Amino acid sequence: NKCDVVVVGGGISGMAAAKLLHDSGLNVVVLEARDRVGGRTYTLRNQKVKYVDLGGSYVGPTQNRILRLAKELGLETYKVNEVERLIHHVKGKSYPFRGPFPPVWNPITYLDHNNFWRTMDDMGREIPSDAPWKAPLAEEWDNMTMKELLDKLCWTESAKQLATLFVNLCVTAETHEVSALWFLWYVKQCGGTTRIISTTNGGQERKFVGGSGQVSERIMDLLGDRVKLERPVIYIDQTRENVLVETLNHEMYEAKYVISAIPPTLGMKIHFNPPLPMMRNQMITRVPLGSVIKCIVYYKEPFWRKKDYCGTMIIDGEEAPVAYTLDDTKPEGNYAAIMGFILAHKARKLARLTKEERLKKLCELYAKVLGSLEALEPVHYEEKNWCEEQYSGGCYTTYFPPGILTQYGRVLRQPVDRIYFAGTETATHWSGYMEGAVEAGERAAREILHAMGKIPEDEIWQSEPESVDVPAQPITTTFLERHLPSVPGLLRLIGLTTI
Amino acid sequence: NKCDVVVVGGGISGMAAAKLLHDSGLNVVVLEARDRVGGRTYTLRNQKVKYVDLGGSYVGPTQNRILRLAKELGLETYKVNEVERLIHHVKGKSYPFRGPFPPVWNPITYLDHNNFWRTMDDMGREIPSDAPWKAPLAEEWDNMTMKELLDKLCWTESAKQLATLFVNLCVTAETHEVSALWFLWYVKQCGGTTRIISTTNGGQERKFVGGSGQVSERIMDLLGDRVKLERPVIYIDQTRENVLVETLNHEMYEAKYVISAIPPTLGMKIHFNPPLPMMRNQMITRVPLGSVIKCIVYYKEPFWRKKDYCGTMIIDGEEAPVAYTLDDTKPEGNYAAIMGFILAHKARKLARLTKEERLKKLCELYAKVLGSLEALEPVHYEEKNWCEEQYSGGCYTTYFPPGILTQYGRVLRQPVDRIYFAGTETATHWSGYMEGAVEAGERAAREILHAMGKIPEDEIWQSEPESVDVPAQPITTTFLERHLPSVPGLLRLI
Ligand SMILES: Cc1cc2nc3c(=O)[nH]c(=O)nc-3n(C[C@H](O)[C@H](O)[C@H](O)COP(=O)(O)OP(=O)(O)OC[C@H]3O[C@@H](n4cnc5c(N)ncnc54)[C@H](O)[C@@H]3O)c2cc1C
Ligand SMILES: Cc1cc2nc3c(=O)[nH]c(=O)nc-3n(C[C@H](O)[C@H](O)[C@H](O)COP(=O)(O)OP(=O)(O)OC[C@H]3O[C@@H](n4cnc5c(N)ncnc54)[C@H](O)[C@@H]3O)c2cc1C
Ligand SMILES: C[C@H](/N=C/c1ccc(OCc2cccc(F)c2)cc1)C(N)=O
Ligand SMILES: C[C@H](/N=C/c1ccc(OCc2cccc(F)c2)cc1)C(N)=O
């Protein structure tokens, strides 16, 4: 019943917040809706797979908070396989390559591709990580979808097609669904295009040995009976001296402060007394999560490696159910597997099928892309459609439709009396990721410590030392990448000389 | 505890559903979150105003269901004042006019304006009212915002400015916030551009004597203790023989079927067992309501009439807090008043001010537009910001951002086991309006009657006889309106 802080939600963000507060000597309770902790992370264990992440999985350089937390809990990472060649499959043919981006040989198409990535980062530099609505052209960019921006920016279909896949893969949403301002912010706050798309030296470099679910599980172990499972919060009352938090199973909790560590829109599942301020009231109806099915197909051996393919496939085209894959084989070389994402409208479309029907479609796609009949002989299959989850709303994260970020963005992490806001959506570095979950949970916890007079104001936001185990190489560009003209730039140069 | 049907929500839609079921002999209970019925309608009574609609108010020709229901409950209508001239205020000057559309004199601008309205209706003819996602170009139009469409269609700033006002006023949202497919559907399902924008012979022709709140209030009177106030629904369990509905104040209700008569997104406030199907689970996070403050300024006399102005003002420009007004004077000629809407981003922006600060800004605007110092001497003021309402989410209605209607639209009124869906958002004629609320509530009720084997399938959807009191004149066009070229059409001809 009585405690110092109630944390609503036992995902990584809520668990990180609770741990910090507990370590500081406060009495905390975590109220979790599900019969498990972890939220958008979920590690399944059985004999066929040993373990598999069906939710969040990848970590990499510059994600120092999640790496530090996991290390303290006794966890280790291993490198995702990128020894052999990557594949770009376009117009029904596969093209192997090395390096983070598929090579482009046509001079005009090359200029267009180069200008696309460059411009994404150029625009990003004008967007403050902690206040995207303060960008000089915030309103102009927010009033445009990513589809509109790509239509303007890409002078070739080749570039527009890859750019579209990039958006779909980053934020599990269609280009016409999302604000240009918000998407440009999203990429910039991860460190830019190269960092976000890279396996080696990027966001997909590593996974945790034994699964990411261990982060939330091991924190639960530390907290003991303080974590309450199957306690969905239904009601928060701030009209009295202590905050009252009610659960669906009829329990009452009393606290000095509350941390909301759930996806912003899931705040709708709670009835508030007094009512929320107008801006938050409407904000939480304007912020959907994306759509994705994560699918893992198991094989006897990692047969792709024999053909000098690492297992990474970038697959363009409406017909392909999966647009992106990575090798999901265990570090020991066993439980050979390919992980693939079914993205955005395809998650909606293909959800109609049976599990067996999806497995068949994936194997037939992989056989084509890898040019290997071996892909037609799976030994096992696991999948999770995150669109069906009442207490997630989708995956990976929340997207902002046109017009919303400028109008409502500033209230995302603004306290409401004694309620403070965590969750990855409120992070300023790797928001949308496990990293952002840690940043946000610890920041919200320190906001409360400051409110209690236990720490100074300058200690609310804290820097993180770089991991010694996962060093970060800097993002570099070549002279030609920096200075080569865009397509319209070249046309202007021609028009000028021919005058 | 035990009944035949639980109706969640006591707005016009829930009340209409409950009345139909009650009249058929079934035991109904209405669970309403607030301490009042009416929802997005709310009639305030006090000595200064007598009565005033702070929510939904206007009814007109072709809205036969709301007119019939109100008449049965003993209500009457009166005509909104449109005797004298309307005003279009643009670039700081007022231009009085007659007829539904402000006149345009520049020849190129005339062609652009004419083409805009015509094209809106042209596109609408290809959109089925009961299935907008079946339009031949559904995906193309759904993947575009109204801003993108207006940028393509309007060759003059004059037309684009008026078109933008039109969108803001219709759906209390910015042009860049909404799907083109959804907006074109919205206009078409009200009967087209002329019908939706007109006072005389259109959606704003009339108001109810005594206020629209009386519709929900008088149905509550009929139902007696069957309406439960301050019972927000928190939990619906369909895992057992009878459906279980739990409220925030700890009560349990047991029923054969449930009608959800709340805005689609407000379904998020209910925890479901078993969980909702995937498509509905995500749909209810993708469908926000618009933003509006409704403001009524009172004066000693309807002084604008002396200058041959009816009180209608169409006001363009960022600086103006209010883009549209109507005369809100009582039919008896007393309680003189001007009703105005603060729309979309302006509702967000000006909410920061005090009530007194908004009153001053409105009076100064009205003095400018009406060219009358009398506008600076208000006797009273009432306002309501619908953005603050936990159990509405906004007003007037739900809008669809780009991409949503095609992907999720088909599940809007699809039953989930024993839950059926009412609410104006599920209507096929005047969805967004009180009329749509009645259509949807009665249809959802008849879906349950059919499920119980009490009526045949062909009786679920029922036509409505035309009101004898509010006859509808047909929408007409002239030869020149039909056949004059667009701006690019004229350029092609040259
Ligand atoms: C398929 C998939 C792929 C992705 N891959 C990666 C990846 O590779 N790398 C990466 O870093 N991130 C990835 N992500 C995203 C990552 O998982 C999230 O960013 C992160 O887990 C979010 O943590 P959170 O604590 O902020 O929120 P959540 O994990 O959503 O936690 C919120 C918790 O609150 C609970 N809750 C909800 N409502 C209530 C209520 N009313 N009362 C009580 N409790 C409630 C929920 O049950 C949940 O446990 C992926 C996610 C998925 C699903
Ligand atoms: C300022 C304004 C101007 C508009 N003007 C007009 C106009 O001129 N003409 C016109 O026709 N229409 C107008 N509209 C729109 C019109 O009011 C609506 O279309 C109509 O009232 C909707 O009725 P409804 O029953 O479908 O939904 P609602 O009126 O929203 O009713 C839903 C009810 O459900 C309740 N509820 C919500 N959640 C729960 C819960 N969890 N448990 C139990 N109950 C719950 C709510 O409290 C509410 O009473 C306007 C509205 C406003 C606010
Ligand atoms: C699962 C999620 N990953 C996001 C992600 C985002 C972008 C990615 O880009 C891959 C890529 C490579 C080459 C070209 C291209 F367009 C995209 C790959 C993954 C995460 N790590 O949380
Ligand atoms: C309040 C809401 N009314 C919607 C409405 C919609 C459109 C309207 O258009 C007025 C108008 C007139 C002339 C030109 C123009 F662009 C708009 C007026 C009102 C309703 N009746 O529910």
mmCIF file with all atom_site columns, C-alpha atoms in Angstrom, chain A residues 142-143 145 147-148 176-177 232-235 246 248 250 265-272 275-276 278-279 281-282 285-291 345 347-348 351 385 387-391 393-394 399 401-404 407-408, chain B residues 142-143 145 147-148 176-177 232-235 246 248 250 265-272 275-276 278-279 281-282 285-291 345 347-348 351 385 387-391 393-394 399 401-404 407-408:
data_model
loop_
_atom_site.group_PDB
_atom_site.id
_atom_site.type_symbol
_atom_site.label_atom_id
_atom_site.label_alt_id
_atom_site.label_comp_id
_atom_site.label_asym_id
_atom_site.label_entity_id
_atom_site.label_seq_id
_atom_site.pdbx_PDB_ins_code
_atom_site.Cartn_x
_atom_site.Cartn_y
_atom_site.Cartn_z
_atom_site.occupancy
_atom_site.B_iso_or_equiv
_atom_site.pdbx_formal_charge
_atom_site.auth_seq_id
_atom_site.auth_comp_id
_atom_site.auth_asym_id
_atom_site.auth_atom_id
_atom_site.pdbx_PDB_model_num
ATOM 1   C CA . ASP A 1 142 ? 6.410   19.111  -39.434 1.00 0.00 ? 142 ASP A CA 1
ATOM 2   C CA . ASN A 1 143 ? 3.615   19.979  -41.896 1.00 0.00 ? 143 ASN A CA 1
ATOM 3   C CA . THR A 1 145 ? 5.112   13.778  -44.477 1.00 0.00 ? 145 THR A CA 1
ATOM 4   C CA . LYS A 1 147 ? 6.607   10.806  -48.514 1.00 0.00 ? 147 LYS A CA 1
ATOM 5   C CA . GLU A 1 148 ? 6.407   14.470  -49.549 1.00 0.00 ? 148 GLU A CA 1
ATOM 6   C CA . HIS A 1 176 ? 3.072   8.990   -45.788 1.00 0.00 ? 176 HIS A CA 1
ATOM 7   C CA . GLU A 1 177 ? 2.169   8.215   -42.133 1.00 0.00 ? 177 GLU A CA 1
ATOM 8   C CA . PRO A 1 232 ? -2.675  -2.982  -14.600 1.00 0.00 ? 232 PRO A CA 1
ATOM 9   C CA . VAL A 1 233 ? -3.075  0.621   -13.408 1.00 0.00 ? 233 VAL A CA 1
ATOM 10  C CA . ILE A 1 234 ? -6.577  2.035   -14.039 1.00 0.00 ? 234 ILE A CA 1
ATOM 11  C CA . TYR A 1 235 ? -6.765  5.195   -11.906 1.00 0.00 ? 235 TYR A CA 1
ATOM 12  C CA . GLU A 1 246 ? -5.498  1.940   -8.241  1.00 0.00 ? 246 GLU A CA 1
ATOM 13  C CA . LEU A 1 248 ? -7.570  -3.496  -12.111 1.00 0.00 ? 248 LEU A CA 1
ATOM 14  C CA . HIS A 1 250 ? -8.727  -3.751  -6.925  1.00 0.00 ? 250 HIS A CA 1
ATOM 15  C CA . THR A 1 265 ? -0.640  6.644   -25.796 1.00 0.00 ? 265 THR A CA 1
ATOM 16  C CA . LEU A 1 266 ? -1.093  3.894   -23.181 1.00 0.00 ? 266 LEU A CA 1
ATOM 17  C CA . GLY A 1 267 ? -1.715  6.693   -20.665 1.00 0.00 ? 267 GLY A CA 1
ATOM 18  C CA . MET A 1 268 ? -5.242  6.591   -22.140 1.00 0.00 ? 268 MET A CA 1
ATOM 19  C CA . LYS A 1 269 ? -5.833  3.354   -20.197 1.00 0.00 ? 269 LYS A CA 1
ATOM 20  C CA . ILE A 1 270 ? -5.667  5.323   -16.944 1.00 0.00 ? 270 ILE A CA 1
ATOM 21  C CA . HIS A 1 271 ? -8.510  7.500   -15.645 1.00 0.00 ? 271 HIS A CA 1
ATOM 22  C CA . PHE A 1 272 ? -7.150  10.692  -14.078 1.00 0.00 ? 272 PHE A CA 1
ATOM 23  C CA . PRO A 1 275 ? -8.315  15.457  -15.436 1.00 0.00 ? 275 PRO A CA 1
ATOM 24  C CA . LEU A 1 276 ? -5.038  15.863  -17.334 1.00 0.00 ? 276 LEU A CA 1
ATOM 25  C CA . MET A 1 278 ? -5.599  19.991  -22.132 1.00 0.00 ? 278 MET A CA 1
ATOM 26  C CA . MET A 1 279 ? -2.342  19.539  -24.037 1.00 0.00 ? 279 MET A CA 1
ATOM 27  C CA . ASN A 1 281 ? -5.153  15.043  -22.758 1.00 0.00 ? 281 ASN A CA 1
ATOM 28  C CA . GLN A 1 282 ? -5.077  15.452  -26.542 1.00 0.00 ? 282 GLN A CA 1
ATOM 29  C CA . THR A 1 285 ? -4.590  10.391  -28.604 1.00 0.00 ? 285 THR A CA 1
ATOM 30  C CA . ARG A 1 286 ? -2.212  11.585  -31.344 1.00 0.00 ? 286 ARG A CA 1
ATOM 31  C CA . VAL A 1 287 ? 0.803   9.288   -30.915 1.00 0.00 ? 287 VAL A CA 1
ATOM 32  C CA . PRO A 1 288 ? 0.464   5.725   -32.323 1.00 0.00 ? 288 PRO A CA 1
ATOM 33  C CA . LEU A 1 289 ? 3.099   2.976   -32.290 1.00 0.00 ? 289 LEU A CA 1
ATOM 34  C CA . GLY A 1 290 ? 4.371   1.249   -35.444 1.00 0.00 ? 290 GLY A CA 1
ATOM 35  C CA . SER A 1 291 ? 3.502   -2.170  -36.879 1.00 0.00 ? 291 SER A CA 1
ATOM 36  C CA . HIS A 1 345 ? 1.418   -2.228  -44.036 1.00 0.00 ? 345 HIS A CA 1
ATOM 37  C CA . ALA A 1 347 ? 2.429   -6.565  -40.923 1.00 0.00 ? 347 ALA A CA 1
ATOM 38  C CA . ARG A 1 348 ? -1.271  -5.642  -41.284 1.00 0.00 ? 348 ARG A CA 1
ATOM 39  C CA . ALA A 1 351 ? -1.377  -11.049 -40.179 1.00 0.00 ? 351 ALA A CA 1
ATOM 40  C CA . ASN A 1 385 ? 3.204   -9.834  -34.042 1.00 0.00 ? 385 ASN A CA 1
ATOM 41  C CA . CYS A 1 387 ? 0.364   -5.158  -33.199 1.00 0.00 ? 387 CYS A CA 1
ATOM 42  C CA . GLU A 1 388 ? -1.796  -7.493  -31.072 1.00 0.00 ? 388 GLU A CA 1
ATOM 43  C CA . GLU A 1 389 ? -0.368  -6.369  -27.701 1.00 0.00 ? 389 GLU A CA 1
ATOM 44  C CA . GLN A 1 390 ? -2.829  -4.468  -25.478 1.00 0.00 ? 390 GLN A CA 1
ATOM 45  C CA . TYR A 1 391 ? -0.025  -3.268  -23.177 1.00 0.00 ? 391 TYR A CA 1
ATOM 46  C CA . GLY A 1 393 ? 0.240   -0.886  -28.764 1.00 0.00 ? 393 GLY A CA 1
ATOM 47  C CA . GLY A 1 394 ? 2.856   -1.832  -31.369 1.00 0.00 ? 394 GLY A CA 1
ATOM 48  C CA . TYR A 1 399 ? 5.694   7.745   -34.312 1.00 0.00 ? 399 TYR A CA 1
ATOM 49  C CA . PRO A 1 401 ? 2.014   12.052  -37.735 1.00 0.00 ? 401 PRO A CA 1
ATOM 50  C CA . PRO A 1 402 ? 2.305   15.425  -39.535 1.00 0.00 ? 402 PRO A CA 1
ATOM 51  C CA . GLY A 1 403 ? 1.682   18.474  -37.349 1.00 0.00 ? 403 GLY A CA 1
ATOM 52  C CA . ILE A 1 404 ? 1.834   16.774  -33.951 1.00 0.00 ? 404 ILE A CA 1
ATOM 53  C CA . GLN A 1 407 ? 1.967   21.355  -31.435 1.00 0.00 ? 407 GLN A CA 1
ATOM 54  C CA . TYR A 1 408 ? 2.235   18.781  -28.623 1.00 0.00 ? 408 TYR A CA 1
ATOM 55  C CA . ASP B 2 142 ? -5.418  8.493   -48.546 1.00 0.00 ? 142 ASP B CA 1
ATOM 56  C CA . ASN B 2 143 ? -1.615  8.842   -48.855 1.00 0.00 ? 143 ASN B CA 1
ATOM 57  C CA . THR B 2 145 ? -2.891  15.301  -46.867 1.00 0.00 ? 145 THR B CA 1
ATOM 58  C CA . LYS B 2 147 ? -2.566  20.473  -47.714 1.00 0.00 ? 147 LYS B CA 1
ATOM 59  C CA . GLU B 2 148 ? -0.960  18.523  -50.577 1.00 0.00 ? 148 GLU B CA 1
ATOM 60  C CA . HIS B 2 176 ? -1.695  19.035  -43.192 1.00 0.00 ? 176 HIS B CA 1
ATOM 61  C CA . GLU B 2 177 ? -3.151  16.947  -40.334 1.00 0.00 ? 177 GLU B CA 1
ATOM 62  C CA . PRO B 2 232 ? -16.907 5.399   -16.267 1.00 0.00 ? 232 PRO B CA 1
ATOM 63  C CA . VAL B 2 233 ? -16.405 1.953   -17.835 1.00 0.00 ? 233 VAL B CA 1
ATOM 64  C CA . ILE B 2 234 ? -12.917 0.523   -17.172 1.00 0.00 ? 234 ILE B CA 1
ATOM 65  C CA . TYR B 2 235 ? -13.176 -3.171  -18.068 1.00 0.00 ? 235 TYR B CA 1
ATOM 66  C CA . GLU B 2 246 ? -16.991 -2.981  -14.749 1.00 0.00 ? 246 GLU B CA 1
ATOM 67  C CA . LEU B 2 248 ? -14.510 2.922   -11.977 1.00 0.00 ? 248 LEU B CA 1
ATOM 68  C CA . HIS B 2 250 ? -16.501 -0.593  -8.559  1.00 0.00 ? 250 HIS B CA 1
ATOM 69  C CA . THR B 2 265 ? -10.172 6.505   -29.478 1.00 0.00 ? 265 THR B CA 1
ATOM 70  C CA . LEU B 2 266 ? -11.879 6.603   -26.056 1.00 0.00 ? 266 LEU B CA 1
ATOM 71  C CA . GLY B 2 267 ? -12.090 2.800   -26.293 1.00 0.00 ? 267 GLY B CA 1
ATOM 72  C CA . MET B 2 268 ? -8.481  3.025   -25.045 1.00 0.00 ? 268 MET B CA 1
ATOM 73  C CA . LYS B 2 269 ? -9.828  3.864   -21.562 1.00 0.00 ? 269 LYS B CA 1
ATOM 74  C CA . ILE B 2 270 ? -11.275 0.338   -21.314 1.00 0.00 ? 270 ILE B CA 1
ATOM 75  C CA . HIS B 2 271 ? -9.179  -2.746  -20.538 1.00 0.00 ? 271 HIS B CA 1
ATOM 76  C CA . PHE B 2 272 ? -10.357 -5.708  -22.633 1.00 0.00 ? 272 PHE B CA 1
ATOM 77  C CA . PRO B 2 275 ? -7.575  -8.437  -25.823 1.00 0.00 ? 275 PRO B CA 1
ATOM 78  C CA . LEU B 2 276 ? -9.062  -6.696  -28.862 1.00 0.00 ? 276 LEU B CA 1
ATOM 79  C CA . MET B 2 278 ? -4.970  -6.555  -33.747 1.00 0.00 ? 278 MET B CA 1
ATOM 80  C CA . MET B 2 279 ? -6.645  -4.170  -36.188 1.00 0.00 ? 279 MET B CA 1
ATOM 81  C CA . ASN B 2 281 ? -6.173  -2.545  -30.991 1.00 0.00 ? 281 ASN B CA 1
ATOM 82  C CA . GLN B 2 282 ? -4.075  -0.283  -33.229 1.00 0.00 ? 282 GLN B CA 1
ATOM 83  C CA . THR B 2 285 ? -4.568  4.778   -31.188 1.00 0.00 ? 285 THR B CA 1
ATOM 84  C CA . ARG B 2 286 ? -4.695  6.329   -34.696 1.00 0.00 ? 286 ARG B CA 1
ATOM 85  C CA . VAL B 2 287 ? -7.886  8.408   -34.614 1.00 0.00 ? 287 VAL B CA 1
ATOM 86  C CA . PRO B 2 288 ? -7.717  11.760  -32.770 1.00 0.00 ? 288 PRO B CA 1
ATOM 87  C CA . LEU B 2 289 ? -10.491 14.349  -32.397 1.00 0.00 ? 289 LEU B CA 1
ATOM 88  C CA . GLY B 2 290 ? -10.189 17.983  -33.523 1.00 0.00 ? 290 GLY B CA 1
ATOM 89  C CA . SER B 2 291 ? -9.539  21.135  -31.491 1.00 0.00 ? 291 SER B CA 1
ATOM 90  C CA . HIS B 2 345 ? -3.996  25.430  -33.961 1.00 0.00 ? 345 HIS B CA 1
ATOM 91  C CA . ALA B 2 347 ? -7.526  26.689  -30.050 1.00 0.00 ? 347 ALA B CA 1
ATOM 92  C CA . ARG B 2 348 ? -4.148  25.374  -28.846 1.00 0.00 ? 348 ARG B CA 1
ATOM 93  C CA . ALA B 2 351 ? -5.956  28.439  -24.618 1.00 0.00 ? 351 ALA B CA 1
ATOM 94  C CA . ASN B 2 385 ? -12.688 24.590  -24.794 1.00 0.00 ? 385 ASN B CA 1
ATOM 95  C CA . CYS B 2 387 ? -9.728  20.066  -25.913 1.00 0.00 ? 387 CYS B CA 1
ATOM 96  C CA . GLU B 2 388 ? -9.750  19.776  -22.107 1.00 0.00 ? 388 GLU B CA 1
ATOM 97  C CA . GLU B 2 389 ? -12.437 17.052  -21.933 1.00 0.00 ? 389 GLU B CA 1
ATOM 98  C CA . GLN B 2 390 ? -11.205 13.640  -20.722 1.00 0.00 ? 390 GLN B CA 1
ATOM 99  C CA . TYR B 2 391 ? -14.412 11.932  -21.902 1.00 0.00 ? 391 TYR B CA 1
ATOM 100 C CA . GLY B 2 393 ? -11.019 14.058  -26.440 1.00 0.00 ? 393 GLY B CA 1
ATOM 101 C CA . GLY B 2 394 ? -11.953 17.085  -28.572 1.00 0.00 ? 394 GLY B CA 1
ATOM 102 C CA . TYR B 2 399 ? -10.338 12.962  -38.018 1.00 0.00 ? 399 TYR B CA 1
ATOM 103 C CA . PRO B 2 401 ? -4.482  11.291  -40.558 1.00 0.00 ? 401 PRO B CA 1
ATOM 104 C CA . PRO B 2 402 ? -2.931  10.183  -43.882 1.00 0.00 ? 402 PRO B CA 1
ATOM 105 C CA . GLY B 2 403 ? -2.896  6.418   -44.471 1.00 0.00 ? 403 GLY B CA 1
ATOM 106 C CA . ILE B 2 404 ? -5.288  5.416   -41.686 1.00 0.00 ? 404 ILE B CA 1
ATOM 107 C CA . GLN B 2 407 ? -5.681  0.518   -43.544 1.00 0.00 ? 407 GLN B CA 1
ATOM 108 C CA . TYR B 2 408 ? -8.046  0.572   -40.545 1.00 0.00 ? 408 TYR B CA 1
#
